[PDB]
């Protein structure tokens, strides 16, 4: 019947961007004027599709990737962007077709002494491919010396903590993000809508 977006947006805890949740969506009907006319998001862009015409489409599957980042980094969740998030944590491809939704979640993800449970990757050898996920915790080797699984000079543990604390400048406050991806297989589409 009806798609379980609430199961995705009204979730209780979201993922760290470096370890971003993906949920496949199928065998349901999706009203997207449910969302965009509700809920008071900050960002609701679509690339390659017009947000009006969403209701009229039909897809084989829809993949919802949900994670959390601070607000100034939301600009990198867009095709052909770069920065520590788009390079090391979540890369959109340059021919991206989908939607990117975001909202402020200070009310919910920042602790008065500062919550530190949302991480991102700061060090990597290569840029992520589109829709790649990397969650290894190996010590990043920055110099000549190999690290042998041990931090210290030029050997860094790659996962960094966000300092999500209210009374942060809004650009350093937490934002929950949901990327919708619409997939087209040579098979009977199963997610449609009104």
């Amino acid at each position: 019947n009806l798609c379980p977006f609430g199961e995705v947006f009204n979730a209780t805890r979201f993922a760290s961007v470096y370890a971003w949740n993906r949920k496949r969506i199928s065998n349901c009907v999706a009203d997207y004027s449910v969302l965009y006319n509700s809920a008071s998001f900050s960002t609701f862009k679509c690339y390659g599709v017009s947000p009006t015409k969403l209701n009229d489409l039909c897809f084989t599957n829809v993949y919802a990737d949900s994670f959390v980042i601070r607000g100034d980094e939301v600009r990198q969740i867009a095709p052909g962007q770069t920065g520590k998030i788009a390079d090391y944590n979540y890369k959109l491809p340059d021919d991206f077709t989908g939607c990117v939704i975001a909202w402020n979640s200070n009310n919910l993800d920042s602790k008065v002494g500062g919550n530190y449970n949302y991480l991102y990757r700061l060090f990597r050898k290569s840029n992520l491919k589109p829709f790649e996920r990397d969650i290894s915790t190996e010590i990043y080797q920055a110099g000549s010396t190999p690290c042998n699984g041990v931090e210290g000079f030029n050997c860094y543990f790659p996962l960094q903590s966000y300092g999500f604390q209210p009374t942060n400048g809004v650009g350093y406050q937490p934002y929950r993000v949901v990327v919708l991806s619409f997939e087209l297989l040579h098979a009977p589409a199963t997610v449609c809508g009104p």
Partner: nanobody
Framework: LQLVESGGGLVQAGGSLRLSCAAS??????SGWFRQAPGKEREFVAA?????????NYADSVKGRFTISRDNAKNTVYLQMNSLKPEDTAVYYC????????????WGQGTQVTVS
């Protein structure tokens, strides 16, 4: 951001000390313990980050003999030292990483640990 160590001393081989390290008072994203024997270079000992879900990391010499633990509310980080050996004699510094760069920028003064 300021770090203080407290707890070393002399122990006959086989004993046990506990090192404690109060931070004033992070912020930072990961704290670890390093040690310096005289005439050696500063070896890594063990580390753990502020993020609840992990992420402990120990060198092999002290794997199983040492335990790190933090208390985020108190902003302190402890190192339980068991089964001590005379090879464990050195000065012990705790350090935290900057929330900005992932490098160990803030250092304690040191605390001397001897093992007869």
């Amino acid at each position: 951001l300021q770090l203080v160590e407290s707890g070393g001393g002399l122990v006959q081989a086989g004993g046990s000390l506990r090192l404690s390290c109060a931070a004033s008072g992070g912020t930072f994203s990961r704290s670890g313990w390093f040690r310096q024997a005289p005439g050696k270079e500063r070896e890594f000992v063990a580390a753990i980050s502020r993020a609840d879900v992990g992420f402990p990391n120990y060198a092999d010499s002290v794997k199983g003999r040492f335990t790190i633990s933090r208390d985020n509310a108190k902003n302190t980080v402890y190192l339980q030292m068991n089964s001590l050996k005379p090879e464990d004699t050195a000065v012990y510094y705790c350090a935290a990483t900057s929330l900005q760069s992932g490098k160990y920028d803030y250092w304690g003064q040191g605390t001397q640990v001897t093992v007869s």
